């Protein structure tokens, strides 16, 4: 799982909702998480795929805590036909905080979009829960999926996704301390069971 | 609730460049890097869970 003793990722999903008529509803997941020892990756192998200026991945990893850093490899399900493109996530904490979720859409390692969502604790089942339900996808992401699906073969989509990354940083709004950081890398799934994923711990050496 | 998004001015152009890098490799002047497959990553990075 992705999480520290300060915050844990419980669920993540990026989806496409379609409502053919008032009696028909459809939901397609492109990627999902939350539906024993993690493998490690040398963070120096991926620094170039993420921003490295004031407030970059190398900078945030150096400041730490280093156990909050994860690299997620996704195999996105693109087998899908009014529509809503959204993202649903849920975090868990033992302490009541105000969290800030930064999602950076990166192209060639450079930030292009930044979604920033301030979320508040809701005490459910003995702990604090931070939920982001149906967060609209940005126009860059919507058009990106549309253009990816438009390619004639899967190998071509994997080549384009080679320069596409997302950096997710969850921070204590008051403390400015990194609670969780997930560097996301993508490939197109080619399985009957659809979307798959692998999670790794990011390490110094 | 409401969210705040900081989009870049050349977003449409950057998205088109992300695709044109693969569609025209000798044409698009995009940054070059080591292919992920050729990097020192775990064998599991390219063998999806079964
Ligand atoms: O990554 C995140 N949101 C952005 C996003 C947008 C679209 C998308 O669908 C794709 C479809 C095809 C190809 C590529 C992407 C996937 C992710 C995000 C937000 N909170 C979390 C928590 C854990 C892990 C990730 N996140
Ligand atoms: Cl998004």
**Boundaries of every domain in chain B:** 11-45
Across the interface, whether the CB atoms of A185 and B36 are under 8 A apart is answered: yes
Return phi, psi of residue A89, to 5°.
-135, 160
B44 SS3 class: helix
Which residues, judged by CB distance below 6 Å to any ligand atom, belong to the binding site of ligand 1? Answer: A 9, 12, 14, 30-31, 76, 87, 89, 103, 137, 141, 145, 166, 168, 182, 184, 186
Query: Which CATH number, 3.30.470.20, 3.20.20.70, 2.70.50.80, 3.40.50.300, labels domain A2-200?
Result: 2.70.50.80
Contact B8 A197 (CB under 8 A): no
CB contact under 8 A, A109 and B18: no
Nearest-by-CA chain A residue for B36? A162
The resolution in angstroms reads: 2.2
Provide, for chain B, the percentages of residues in helix, strand and coil under a 3-state DSSP scheme, each rounded to the nearest 5: 40, 5, 60
CA dihedral sign, ordered A4, A88, A50, B22: positive
Pure H helices in chain B: 11-23
Are A115 and B3 a contacting pair, CB within 8 Å? yes
Using an 8 Å Cβ cutoff, are A171 and A33 in contact? no
Q: CA B45, CA A187: separation in Å to the nearest integer?
A: 10
- Of A115, A110, A116, the closest CA to residue A52 belongs to A110
Which neighbouring-strand residues pair with A128?
A: A93, A123
Mutation for B interface: A37, A77, A105, most B CBs within 10 A: A105
């Amino acid at each position: 799982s992705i999480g520290t003793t300060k915050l844990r990722l419980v669920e993540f999903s990026a989806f496409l909702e379609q409502q053919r008529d008032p009696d028909s509803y459809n939901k397609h997941l492109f990627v999902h998480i939350g539906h024993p020892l993690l493998e490690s990756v040398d963070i120096r192998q991926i620094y170039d795929k993420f921003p490295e200026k004031k407030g970059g991945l190398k900078e945030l990893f150096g400041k730490g805590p280093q156990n909050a850093f994860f690299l997620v490899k996704f195999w996105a399900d693109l087998n899908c036909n009014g529509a809503f493109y959204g993202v649903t996530s849920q975090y868990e904490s033992s302490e009541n905080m105000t969290v800030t979720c930064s999602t950076k859409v990166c192209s060639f390692g450079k930030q292009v979009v930044e979604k920033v969502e301030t979320e508040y604790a809701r005490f459910e089942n003995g702990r604090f829960v931070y939920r982001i339900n149906r967060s609209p996808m940005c126009e860059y992401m919507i058009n990106f999926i549309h253009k990816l699906k438009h390619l004639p073969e899967k190998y071509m989509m994997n080549s384009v996704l080679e320069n596409f990354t997302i950096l997710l940083v969850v921070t204590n709004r008051d403390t400015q301390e990194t609670l969780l950081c997930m560097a996301c890398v993508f490939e197109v799934s080619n399985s009957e069971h659809g979307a798959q994923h692998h999670i790794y711990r990011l390490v110094k050496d | 609730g409401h969210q705040i998004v900081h989009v870049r001015g050349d977003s449409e152009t950057d998205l088109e460049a992300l695709f044109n890098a693969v569609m025209n490799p000798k044409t698009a002047n995009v940054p070059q890097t080591v292919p992920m497959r050729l990097r020192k990553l775990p064998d599991s990075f390219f063998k999806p869970p079964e």
